[PDB]
Structures are given as structure tokens and as C-alpha cells.
Amino acid sequence: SARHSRFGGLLSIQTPDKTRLTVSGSQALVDEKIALQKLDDSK
Amino acid sequence: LRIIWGTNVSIQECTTNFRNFLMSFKYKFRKILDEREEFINNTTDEELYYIKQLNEMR
Amino acid sequence: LPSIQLPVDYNNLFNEITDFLVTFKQKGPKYMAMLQKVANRELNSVIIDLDDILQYQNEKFLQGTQADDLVSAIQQNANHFTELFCRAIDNNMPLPTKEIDYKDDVLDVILNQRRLRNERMLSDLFPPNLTRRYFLYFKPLSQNCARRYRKKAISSKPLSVRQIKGDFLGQLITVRGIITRVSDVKPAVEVIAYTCDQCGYEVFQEVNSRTFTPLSECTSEECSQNQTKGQLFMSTRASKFSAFQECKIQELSQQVPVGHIPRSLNIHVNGTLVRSLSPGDIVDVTGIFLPAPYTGFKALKAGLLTETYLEAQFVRQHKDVYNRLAKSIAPEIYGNLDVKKALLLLLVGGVDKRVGDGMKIRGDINVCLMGDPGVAKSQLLKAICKISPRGVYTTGALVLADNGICCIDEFDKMDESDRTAIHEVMEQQTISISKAGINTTLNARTSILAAANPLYGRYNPRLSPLDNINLPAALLSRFDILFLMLDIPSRDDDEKLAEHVTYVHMHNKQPDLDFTPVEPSKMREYIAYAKTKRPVMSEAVNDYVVQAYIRLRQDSKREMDSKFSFGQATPRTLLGIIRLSQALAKLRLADMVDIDDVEEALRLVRVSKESLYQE
DNA sequence: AGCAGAT
DNA sequence: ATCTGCTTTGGGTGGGTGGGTGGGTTGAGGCAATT
Ligand SMILES: Nc1ncnc2c1ncn2[C@@H]1O[C@H](COP(=O)(O)OP(=O)(O)OP(=O)(O)O)[C@@H](O)[C@H]1O
Ligand SMILES: [Mg+2]
């Protein structure tokens, strides 16, 4: 992320069914593969 | 689909909107917005602004 | 945990509150109209008038359907009734009448998604405070209304900080005092909104204490059923914050007993009451007197002693022209027409300071009073400082006097540091601070009004003025007008002064009756109007003042040939003369500076010193 | 009371 | 997963072989240098 760690951008990804998951990170704000990678890694 | 938390505005629409704004925009729009259209010239105002700003930055 | 049987049932009280809100009228019901305005986002503060509750109670009694005493219950225990009333309002909030952008609000979207998720789960919430957009306050029971209905109003009866004892805790009381300190507004958290990085749910936690322990593990149904360990994280965008501000209230001088020291009491202000208190105001704060329990180890150590504070709920704040103004400046002294005229000229301080060539001529008229002890110097200073809007009274503060007249008493005694400070102010009109801790520069275009005693304590005719004055000759020269007031014994004057002072002591009023002093408010507003104005000068007046200057310089040189002269005239004197003329024109309210104003200024400078020195 | 460690 | 155990705030109911570049800040009294 270009900005600092505490910038604080929050995400809401929509699953094929109508449920929303939350991800943090500008890269997630831009991309979806990064979002899924973070979802897997945060487990 | 990517949506900002707590809102109903898509990120993809935002990205495409700002990309369209940057690739195509002229100072004449700003001049007319501020009610200064009569000061519009024919060379600087009619040339792309932020494209020039990106080229000079590069 | 044993139990008691108190004679209060909250169910009848809740029913009474609901009936009062829905039915009371004083158009439609007052509180229903207020709730309608609250729903439409117009209003954000609901004030409950205990007078209205008393009126409703007495109307019910007159109808014969006697009910519980709501006002006494509220006064005796007020913390509970805030929540009770908030619940009642939440139940009866009318639907909005004007369409609003619900989707813009974060909370609306979040709660809609929560509803959708709950519906999906069922097919296979949030505290009430979170959605509240209003604050509730209690207006005390007014004295007149209590007397009208034959009742005693404890809430509106004022108390000093001394009378607020430990048995008043938990009640609705009023305090009288002056505010000595107000802190900056800051966000105090009421409800915290978390998020789950795995489950995609949101949690809410309520905070009603100085401290709290944040959640770290998801508690959602999905997480527990799936056992997935999803960390909870805070989100400030969804939380609920209330403006917070802490103040301090101190006893008035007249309330402290003999041989005692004043006490102070803390005040908490939340919601829309913030920024309604500033240091120096004398107020009647109405609030709920509550304790402030400690937490954790500090609670164990502190024992049973408890801090206390007041939850602010309602705040009541307490409250020929030349000759006339001069004589009205201070009617309790014996008239000093020239000094009063000069002081009025100082007060108005008319000047055209727009040189714009690098710097400008000083835009303030400075006045100095020097006299043997016995004349009304301190009284003149006090009066001239009370009249002025920016007057600051000090004894040998400058920041408060910026762009205003400064009232310095005992000028001669002052220390060298302050003398250098004023010397800087006059020349540069700037306050400069050079410290490692802080480096702040402030402009100071403020006038100085000084009072001093001669070197030996009294004026000595044998010694010339310069030797009598301890202050540097440059400082005296920089003064625009220097007044020397002397105490000469005389049968007639002494008799007049004695009669005046003695009449004042016997009757407590002004003795004079030939003329009626002008009201202070009219004089103040006229002075402000004059300050607003701006005169102008022509070439003929310029030539006249130039001629006056050469005459004055020749006379002053001739006088300086001897030792009696205070000091030879300089360009500073010319600038002072034109400054006085400009101020006089401002008083006249005319652009064109008449020769009369210049002549009067010349007479004033002459009589400032020569009139009394020649005596 | 919250958190840091041994069975 | 449960049982066992230490330590705060800040302050003298921890101290001066921990010090004052870890914070608790006015009041009095002695000494050198300035006068
Ligand atoms: N003309 C006067 N009329 C009435 N009272 C006067 C007059 N002149 C002086 N007094 C009284 O003289 C008393 C002393 O005056 P004040 O304290 O203002 O000045 P001062 O004694 O010259 O000042 P300092 O404190 O510097 O020695 C005040 O009570 C004031 O009321
Ligand atoms: Mg005095």
C-alpha cells in the first residue's frame, strides 16, 4: 500500500449469494485476487 | 463485486469515472463552471490538462 | 443482596410519562410537535420543562384523576428518568414528513444489511442508543411556577459549592458561581462498532464508564457454530460519539464564609450543551449531581471516598457633547475637565494609519497621569478601564489589551523587564516571545494609560519635572500627552472637595444637580460609533498644522534654553497633534478636519503640562 | 481484575 | 482448557546499592557572583 499502515480503508466483498465479507487493505480495495489471498491467509 | 463498507457505491464505477476524468478533461470546463467562460483562450484551455501534467511528471 | 419496598413503581411513572408526552397541550401537543421536528432531522435536542409536568399534574388533579408526583420523583432521582423518557420518546417517534437520503447515512445501510442477514439466517439487534439522534435535558422547576401552584422548587433554588453536600447526590440541583476553566470539546464514545474479518458480521458494545475493555474475539452465531476464530477490530466510522467537555465552577467572593478559601466543583457537558460555558461567566448551572466511581486497582485503593461531578442540563447566563461625556466619565470625583477630555480622546483613538511605505505612524494616543499622592489617579484609571471594552487593569495582561487601551497603575515602580516590554510595544506594536518551549509572535496595537508618582513621592518645585520623573526621557517623549496633576491646598477648593466626598459618604449618590450625567450605555455606543468612522484632511489644514509646528518648535527651543522646560518639541509632537486632531474629528463625525479640532488639540497639549507647571 | 506461565 | 500468581494506578501503608533524559513543582535557606 502506498499510504501508511494506519490509513484505514475498509472493504465489503459480495459473495455469489447476498452476503458481504470485510477485508482491510488498499490492495484489496483495488483487486480481488489479493482480497481472496488475504481472506485465506487471515485464517 | 467490490463495495466500500457501509455505503452503496461501487469501486469499479469510481475507478472508471476517475480514469475517464483524467484521460479527457480541459480547463475550459473549470472556467465555465466558475462563470469565467469569456476568459477562455484557444490553446491552453482546449488542450488536455491532466494528460500534460502526467507527461511532465514522467 | 437483600431487598427493600420503596413507595415508587416505575410502571405507573412510565405510563404517566407516555400520557404526558402524547396528551399535554399548551395547535397540537407541544412535545409531539417537538418530536415531529426531531424526526425530520431539524431538531437534535429535546428539553423537558418541569413546569409543564407540574401543570399537567395539576390539570389531572383538577379533572379528579389524581396521579403520581412526577416532578418530585424526577428531582429526587433524575438519572433513571433520562432513560425512561428516552424510551418513551423512542416508542412514540412519529414518521418523517420530509423525504431524506437514507442511503447516504452509513448506519441506515449497515442496519439494512443486518436485517437482510438475519432474514437469510432465519430462512435457513443494536442498542437503542445507537440510532438515537437527539439528546434529552431537564429544565428545572421555575420559582414563579412553583409559587403559583404552592410548591417548593429545590431544583431551581440556587446553591453555592459549599452547600452541595454528600446527601444531594443523585438529585437535580442548581449551582451558582463563576466558571474558571473549560476544556476543549472532544469525542466521548457511547457505542463501539466492531467488525469480523471472517464472518462478515458486526458487533456493538456499550460504554458507560471512564474505561472499557475492547472485544478481541468474534461472538457472532456463525463464528461460534463454525468455531472459526475471527478477530474483532474497531471501526470509528460506525461508532457513536457524543461531544464531551469538562468545566470547573468556583464560589463567588460573597458566598465564602469569613476566614475561608473558595471551593470548586467539576461539571460535565454532553451533547448540544457544549460550548455554552466559557471562563469568567457567572452562571446558574442546573445538572444531576452524581459520583464518579474509580475502576480497577484505583477503586480498591481509593476506599469509600468518591469523586463527584455535575451533569449539565440547563445554563442561565447573567448580564456640548464633549463636556457632557467628560463630566459623565467619572461623576464621583471632583471635576477635571482637561484630564477627562484627554482620556476620552485616548478612548476613541482616532487615527489614519495607512502609510504603506514600509511602516506607519502609530495608531494609538497614549496618556500618562503623574501626580502627588492624594489626587484621584486610581479612581480615574478604574473608571476609564471599566468603560472601555478592552480595558485591562494591572499594577506595576498586555495580551488581553491588544487593540485596546491598557490600564497600568503604579507605572514608576514597574520592573525593567516590563519597561522594556512596553518600550517594544510602543515602538513596534508587537509582542515577541523567544523561548525553546514556544516561539509565538503576536501583534499589539494597544494604547497605554499609566499612573505614577514623582521620584521623592511628591512633586518638588525646586527640581524640574525631568528630575522628578524617574522614567527615561525617551519614554516620556514617546507619550502622546503627558498630564501632571498637583495637589495645591486652597480654602475654597478644599471646602468643595470635602463637601462632595462627605455628601457621597452620607447619601451614597452623586451630589451634583446642575447637570444630569449621560447614561453610560449611550456614551459607550457613541464611542464605538466614533471608532468606526474615518475622517480626512486637506492641504489647507496641512499648512495650518505645519505653521503651528514651527511656532511650537521655536517656543519649545526658547523654553529649553532654560531648565524649566519638560522637553523640546520634536516630530513626535507633530504626529501627536495630528493624531489628536483626527480623533477630535472622529468625535465630530465629519470627514473634513476643521481648524477648530486642531486648535482644541493644541490647547489640550498646552494645558497638559504648562497650565499646572506655571502655577 | 488482566494478563503471563506450568500441569 | 484450567489453575497459580504479580501488579498497578501513581504515591510515600515500596523505596534510596535504580536514579532524575521515568513524572509527581512551590517554599525556604545557603552560597557564589554580581553588585
Ligand atoms: N477630586 C476628588 N474627589 C473625591 N475623592 C477624591 C478626589 N481626589 C482624590 N480622592 C480620593 O482620594 C483617595 C486616594 O486616591 P487614589 O487612591 O485614587 O490615588 P492616590 O492616593 O494619589 O494614589 P497612590 O495609591 O498611587 O498613592 C481615593 O479615596 C479618592 O476617592
Ligand atoms: Mg493610586
Ligand SMILES: [Zn+2]
Ligand atoms: Zn465472525
